Amino acid sequence: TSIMAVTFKDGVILGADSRTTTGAYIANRVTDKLTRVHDKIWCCRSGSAADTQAIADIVQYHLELYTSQYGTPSTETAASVFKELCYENKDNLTAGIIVAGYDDKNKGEVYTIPLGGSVHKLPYAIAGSGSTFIYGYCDKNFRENMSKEETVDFIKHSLSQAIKWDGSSGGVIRMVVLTAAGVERLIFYPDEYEQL
Amino acid sequence: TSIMAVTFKDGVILGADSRTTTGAYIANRVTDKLTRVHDKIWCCRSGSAADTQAIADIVQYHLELYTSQYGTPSTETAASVFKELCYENKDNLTAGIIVAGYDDKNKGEVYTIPLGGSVHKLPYAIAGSGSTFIYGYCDKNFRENMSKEETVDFIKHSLSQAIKWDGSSGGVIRMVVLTAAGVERLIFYPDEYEQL
Amino acid sequence: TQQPIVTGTSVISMKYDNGVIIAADNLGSYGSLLRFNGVERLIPVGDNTVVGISGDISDMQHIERLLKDLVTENAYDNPLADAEEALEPSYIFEYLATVMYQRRSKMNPLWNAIIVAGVQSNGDQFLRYVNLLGVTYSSPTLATGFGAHMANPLLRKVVDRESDIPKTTVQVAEEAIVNAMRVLYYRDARSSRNFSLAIIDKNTGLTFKKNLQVENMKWDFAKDIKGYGTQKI
Amino acid sequence: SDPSSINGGIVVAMTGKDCVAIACDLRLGSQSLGVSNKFEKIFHYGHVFLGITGLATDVTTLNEMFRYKTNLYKLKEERAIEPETFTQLVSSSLYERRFGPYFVGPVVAGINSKSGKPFIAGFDLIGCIDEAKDFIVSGTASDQLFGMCESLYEPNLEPEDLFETISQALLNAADRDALSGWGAVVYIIKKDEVVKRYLKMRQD
Amino acid sequence: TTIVGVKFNNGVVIAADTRSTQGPIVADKNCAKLHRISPKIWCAGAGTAADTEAVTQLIGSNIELHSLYTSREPRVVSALQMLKQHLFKYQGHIGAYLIVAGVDPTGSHLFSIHAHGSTDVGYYLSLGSGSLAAMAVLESHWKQDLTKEEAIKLASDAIQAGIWNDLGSGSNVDVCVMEIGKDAEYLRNYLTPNVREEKQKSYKFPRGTTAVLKESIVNICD
Amino acid sequence: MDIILGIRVQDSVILASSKAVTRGISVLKDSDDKTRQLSPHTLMSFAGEAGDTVQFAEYIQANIQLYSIREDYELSPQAVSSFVRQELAKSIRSRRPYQVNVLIGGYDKKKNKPELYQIDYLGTKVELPYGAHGYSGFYTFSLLDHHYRPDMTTEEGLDLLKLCVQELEKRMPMDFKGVIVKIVDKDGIRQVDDF
Amino acid sequence: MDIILGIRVQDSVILASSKAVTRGISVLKDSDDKTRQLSPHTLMSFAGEAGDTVQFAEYIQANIQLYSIREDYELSPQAVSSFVRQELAKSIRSRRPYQVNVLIGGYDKKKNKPELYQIDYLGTKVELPYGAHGYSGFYTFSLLDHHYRPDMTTEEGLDLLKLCVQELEKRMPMDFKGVIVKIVDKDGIRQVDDF
Amino acid sequence: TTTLAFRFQGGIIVAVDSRATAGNWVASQTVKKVIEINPFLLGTMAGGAVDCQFWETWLGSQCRLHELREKERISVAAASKILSNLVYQYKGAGLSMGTMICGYTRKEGPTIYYVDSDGTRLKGDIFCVGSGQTFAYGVLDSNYKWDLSVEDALYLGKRSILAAAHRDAYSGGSVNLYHVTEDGWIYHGNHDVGELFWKVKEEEGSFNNVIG
Amino acid sequence: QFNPYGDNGGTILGIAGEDFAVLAGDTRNITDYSINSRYEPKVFDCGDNIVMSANGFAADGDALVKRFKNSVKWYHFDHNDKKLSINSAARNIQHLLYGKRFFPYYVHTIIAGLDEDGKGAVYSFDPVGSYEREQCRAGGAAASLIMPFLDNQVNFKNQYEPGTNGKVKKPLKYLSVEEVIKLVRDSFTSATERHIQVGDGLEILIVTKDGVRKEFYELKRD
Ligand SMILES: *[C@@](C)(CO)[C@](*)(O)[C@H](Cc1ccccc1)NC(=O)[C@H](Cc1ccc(OC)cc1)NC(=O)[C@H](C)NC(=O)CN1CCOCC1
Ligand SMILES: *[C@@](C)(CO)[C@](*)(O)[C@H](Cc1ccccc1)NC(=O)[C@H](Cc1ccc(OC)cc1)NC(=O)[C@H](C)NC(=O)CN1CCOCC1
Ligand SMILES: *[C@@](C)(CO)[C@](*)(O)[C@H](Cc1ccccc1)NC(=O)[C@H](Cc1ccc(OC)cc1)NC(=O)[C@H](C)NC(=O)CN1CCOCC1
Ligand SMILES: *[C@@](C)(CO)[C@](*)(O)[C@H](Cc1ccccc1)NC(=O)[C@H](Cc1ccc(OC)cc1)NC(=O)[C@H](C)NC(=O)CN1CCOCC1
Ligand SMILES: [Mg+2]
Ligand SMILES: [Mg+2]
Ligand SMILES: [Mg+2]
Ligand SMILES: [Mg+2]
């Protein structure tokens, strides 16, 4: 994997490639690594497909139950539930999860949860095998309060480079826009992003 | 290490950080990783300090002897001698060497020699532990036939990011300019490059 | 005993009615890092043989030097170096096969899989494989790495046995090869889009095509896939 | 320390024309030491025949266990268990020990008393059913048995011909295996008579 | 094994070869790797043969009880969820690799499941030792808007690639078509392109060839 | 431990068990009885891991004695052997298995027949005319294949046994300090004092 | 191999060496002489790794015999022991060392004195009144500490030796098939036939 | 393998089985484990097949060269020691050989030397060697006397290999018999266990463990 | 760590008649679960009426065959063009194989031809050089499947004369070239069914006093 989430003026955008590997064989070249845990709380998954999937399914259950009793959960709450699972089962999991969501009070928020099970709230976050290659780029090109179109370009260019160097990353770039407007799914094919 | 060499209009520039580590302890924070093997053929050294040092000393000997018999060697010749040592002793060495030199016929040339002992001629080259973090940046920002000042900025910014993320890299940035004019040593201190 | 560092992935090849085709992408991987992108892994020897090499690139470069040196040595005191006593594909192959097996026998292999494709002086097509173990075999279609698993099945639908070779044209054969290279780009995590292709024909000679790309890729269906089971948004 | 080849043994079963055959060797050893030349590996519960190869303590245990279950089956169902049903019972019981398995290679053989169809089946140690028209093999000389059966076998053999075929398959396979042999038993099974013959084979 | 799944206009088709192996030996030349979970949800299995059988029956059993409880026809996502949660619980020690396909009130579906409990979605999928041979055919010929007959052709072509080019696959081709509105049709031995040639000789022995020591009538009666 | 033999003849079962108990480079005892009477017409010899052997023998002994008291009846050698096998078959999949091999020699009073059962620690049972555990078998089985006859007297069985002990003392690397011999017949269990 | 002893008394040196040669679970021989006469008044017993023992003994024997012929003179027990030690000291740092322990018993004709040298495979030499190699020492050294006196006769030395062999046959786990005894005195080397 | 050879009143008996194994796979049932070095010298083979075959055929070449150089047939002691010194040079390399060098010379009389790959070399009257040696020892030792007739000794050797062929899973095939006298070795035929077992069972009344 | 060996599969078969001998072998070459070639011959005419096959690890097999062919060539040069008898070839091959006792050729080797009395001969070797002449031998992957069939059908093992109370054995007799080729083809079709590394093609070399003839037959390609 290459995955990232970026806050901006109107909310937050999650981005991800679509490559799933079993060794050097590509098991699935059109994978959806962007998964919904609530209306406007989504996460990007890196590491073990089985572990991140089972975690995400449990989190979705917890937030559905939270919603029925206490109303819409904060993005921070969602991240805390991810953490509780990742931290307490750290010996049995290989999951690097980025959480992103849109409140109306708090706007766009991004929380990253690396292998240890620690939580880190950030303006933007990168993760997965391909993220190593774009630390320099993303640090140099990220600004706060970007526009939607600026943020889409930032993610598209960033993941393009990650994909270009990381063999474990590739295929299409999927993105998910989280704003007051609603939820927008985006997709960008190789022919477009390769020659950026 | 973070090291790189970049060709440009007037010749070639080699750049490097100054950090030497024994584990997490910094044995030397003002190391000179840019070493002369001939008047206008230099190399950047990554990997084992002992191995790269012994190799460089042997190469310097070979090119001094070459010079006495056949005149000034090409940059390609220097790279071939590095390769011959790195390839034939691949089981006993941990050396990742970048070779850069200035002919008057061939202008600036850069050859990279990774762990295997293979040779790769390139417009620019990056290597060392910190280079992983600037693949995305360098690919996006490198142009051919840059000016001296543009190339100095490219290296300064690139190594600044490598230093920022790689714990095994740091200290000052040293650079060496190879042109028809001569040989110019440059140095850039943390206070300058950190806040780029 | 080695371990390969900078590597090249699949080399694929097949026979057709008049000649042979061979192809290989232009990538030099460094583990999962796609480090080098201008690597030529098809190396012609004379105008009647192409050697395609996969595996460790430093060892490939060494083999390049051997073949280049072989041409030089063959020319020495040889008035018929460009005629009756020119290097044949069978000569080049057996030399490599000899070297490979000696190196494995000294527990110091050249970490490669090689396919020698060419046309003999009598017009016969030559296609034979050799690897780090010194294992050799011949077939109407040959491939290395992932190529063996994904290309061969496709190429064998065209030439399934010896008698299918006269029936196969160069247009059909090249199409199958280019299609195979696309499939490998979809499914091999250490492949690249850019590749080189070489035809050695008994009439038209050696055509060496560089800077080819995989095109006509199906990706559009991706926009319909959501989640991993129960997701609808 | 490979449980499947400490004691040794083989079982083979074939179908014929309105009949089935099941055969086994008689050896029980402790690796190189031959210990018993009387150790039979075929048992029956009513008209359903079960042969079991592998670790002898499990062979014995499983026999005792299936006797147990088929006896309760019969008391409650008020009828003898059929080969198709018994095959499923074996599969269930073996898979119940998925992560602490019996080290065995069972083979079911019998004629359905209602439809009159000949039925054979085999399993791995963990329960996977291997149903077959022609033949099933099991034991330390299974490679050999597969080779003999695949060349010697033909469909629709009469009981007296099938006997010669299954016997020759077993005998010549056992003679190419160090842990199999030391005697042999062959069951020829027809709709309502069962003949049991002990074979003369080389005793080395 | 080689197993495949292919979506088309009004449904989904799955196919499989019919070889079972024990090391380099062919244990079974014609086993059925296509399992019924419910009438209109079928499952193709690769990996540990007993695990694919056991896990498919267990979930099929619970799916039936669930279908009775809810007075509703079972959904593919229910089988998917139950299988994946079960396999995950055992951390891959149950070596089942499955392609799950079927039609339900929601539509037609195609999923894959790996032994550690990860699931994927696709228009075309392949699992098993011959999955790469099959996937090469699927990547070469698959398109959007396949007809029923085009999908069957593609699926069996993908399985054939496995049969011929993979040593872990052989013998025949089984197919199951699940179309919306209709019954699922299980096409056992849809193709049989590996028929054993006539043997040169008959090895039926002269009667009395085998030396016998003892005879006895066995009592199966009461 | 190490050497335990058994020979079933016409009218009796003869068990021979070595007397040595060794640990390290010291023979701690040279007069050890490696047997327990399970019931008046049933005797069990044992060999294997230290501690386990006796603990197992005495556990089996108590169980059979409990049965005898409860039913006021002696269990058949076949039934005792089946009970013992089942216990060992349980044991092998336990947390710590009993590493004990046994021979059960008994006279069945209902059949008027001697019976010899060989059972290893895995729970592998066989009825034999003659039996052995450990390396002993590698010499005795072939010797008995040659010299043993089914219709032999108790006296002929003892001569056949001396022939086994002689061969073992000649070719075995360890000093096992001779054997204690016991006979099991219709009149019960008795020990031969001079061997 | 395994058991080799030595006792130096007033006027002689007595060497006792076990007769058994074993491999696996078979005693292949029960009459093996684990000794070589190096010279008329010098005898070497040996024990250790199979093959090495004899190869080493015979190699040493040839060398000493060569010396005797060249100088027409017998080397002193002290000199022979020093030669043997040096060979073993070389061996231990070789590619494949001789894994052989020895006892050298000799009568020095110049001093008119018996001498007993104990040398292990590492090349560790000591002159002793009594010596042993292997597990034997763990029983015999303490026994001899108690019963041995420096002024004993050859006959008293043999009784003291019987006392050692008796203890070993009682407490040692392996059957070593008795010993061959040899005496080394002013009149040369002779073997006791009944022991 | 089971092999034996023993000394008695009337010379030397040598008997061997004929099975070759590759693990539990039976490789052959018709293998020659005795080599006739010369008319007065025999060699038996147990362990690695080629190790024994190659080096005992080599031994024969060395014995042949000795009689060309010395105009005299090599002693059993010297022939056995050539083989033992050879294998000792290879000690540690992983050779596997259990051999017996049997023969007659005027100066020695009938003589048997046991030679193995650890470098052990032993003169003796009786040896059994191989995976089935213990089974052979059991029968031989309990029926051996010095005063056996040639007829009885021949049979005892045959019966001892048969005993091992039966019990030892890694022995069988057939018995090869030899008798060695002052006049050289005499071959006493190949005896397939397939027929011999039943012939012996019936005539001797033994092997009552088997279902007859 | 570098593993200098590999398994290229295949299987070979030698049968000897009265005045002829056959050496058969399948033409399939494999590594792991892949087919490298459907027609890669491994039975060779080596001159002097000797045919040879070295099955197992192909690189070691080709190396050995190549060296023996060379051995025959130098035998002619050094000994006045004398014919290398089959027994002499066998012994020569023992020394080739044993020369690498501590780094073996991973091959089971078979040669066939005629002895010095004009009778058919088959010699077979282990990987390190031990050899034996037989009427009958299979080698390689499916040896375990084929060999007991040959024991039964060529040497008539376990076959008694009918009605003789299992007392009189079926008598040994030489087989015709027609009968031998039937057994070869049935042996290989049987082996092909049940072993995954055996298939594609069968190639037989027949050796008479008139020379070496070839015969080829298709095998199942799954
Ligand atoms: C990239 C490859 C590297 O981080 C991504 O993290 C990617 C994330 C992903 C993929 C699909 C769906 C959601 C998220 N990870 C993978 O594709 C993953 C590679 C991986 C496997 C195991 C790991 O540690 C245990 C870490 C990364 N692929 C898989 O999980 C596939 C489906 N399964 C296997 O490869 C089988 N594994 C199971 C665990 O044991 C090793 C073999
Ligand atoms: C960075 C750290 C990572 O590539 C650079 O390559 C840097 C290069 C350098 C440093 C000084 C002078 C010239 C070039 N490498 C190091 O600083 C190096 C770290 C390193 C050590 C060993 C390696 O593989 C064998 C690879 C990288 N530091 C050293 O060599 C120091 C001086 N020595 C040690 O740490 C002692 N080593 C010796 C080898 O065994 C491990 C302990
Ligand atoms: C192809 C043939 C793989 O080569 C398929 O995946 C096939 C799937 C299948 C499904 C249902 C019915 C038949 C066949 N898999 C097998 O046939 C499978 C191959 C396999 C064996 C063992 C494995 O783990 C080491 C993994 C894959 N064969 C079996 O399951 C056979 C019947 N069983 C055994 O060999 C017993 N093994 C099972 C695993 O545990 C150890 C003992
Ligand atoms: C009995 C049967 C026990 O094996 C005998 O010892 C028998 C003796 C014998 C003598 C001459 C001719 C044939 C047989 N030994 C074998 O049959 C022997 C068993 C054995 C194998 C390997 C060993 O390794 C140290 C030791 C003993 N079998 C073989 O030699 C077989 C035919 N060949 C191989 O196993 C090939 N191996 C040999 C060792 O190197 C690797 C390849
Ligand atoms: Mg990529
Ligand atoms: Mg057998
Ligand atoms: Mg046997
Ligand atoms: Mg096949």
PDB file of C-alpha atoms and ligand atoms in Angstrom, chain D residues 32 178 182 203-204, chain H residues 19 164-173, ligand 7:
ATOM      1  CA  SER D  32      12.662 -52.074  11.204  1.00  0.00           C
ATOM      2  CA  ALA D 178       9.836 -52.472   3.552  1.00  0.00           C
ATOM      3  CA  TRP D 182       4.133 -60.361   6.165  1.00  0.00           C
ATOM      4  CA  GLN D 203       7.635 -63.338   4.318  1.00  0.00           C
ATOM      5  CA  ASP D 204      10.490 -60.802   4.123  1.00  0.00           C
TER       6      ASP D 204
ATOM      7  CA  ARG H  19      18.161 -56.627  -0.513  1.00  0.00           C
ATOM      8  CA  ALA H 164      16.900 -61.807   9.817  1.00  0.00           C
ATOM      9  CA  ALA H 165      15.306 -61.590   6.353  1.00  0.00           C
ATOM     10  CA  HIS H 166      11.996 -62.317   8.089  1.00  0.00           C
ATOM     11  CA  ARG H 167      12.146 -59.967  11.103  1.00  0.00           C
ATOM     12  CA  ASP H 168      14.338 -57.148   9.742  1.00  0.00           C
ATOM     13  CA  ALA H 169      12.319 -54.950   7.386  1.00  0.00           C
ATOM     14  CA  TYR H 170      15.562 -53.881   5.672  1.00  0.00           C
ATOM     15  CA  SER H 171      16.801 -57.418   4.934  1.00  0.00           C
ATOM     16  CA  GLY H 172      15.506 -60.061   2.534  1.00  0.00           C
ATOM     17  CA  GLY H 173      15.420 -61.161  -1.093  1.00  0.00           C
TER      18      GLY H 173
HETATM   19 MG    MG J   7      12.510 -58.106   5.719  1.00  0.00          MG
END
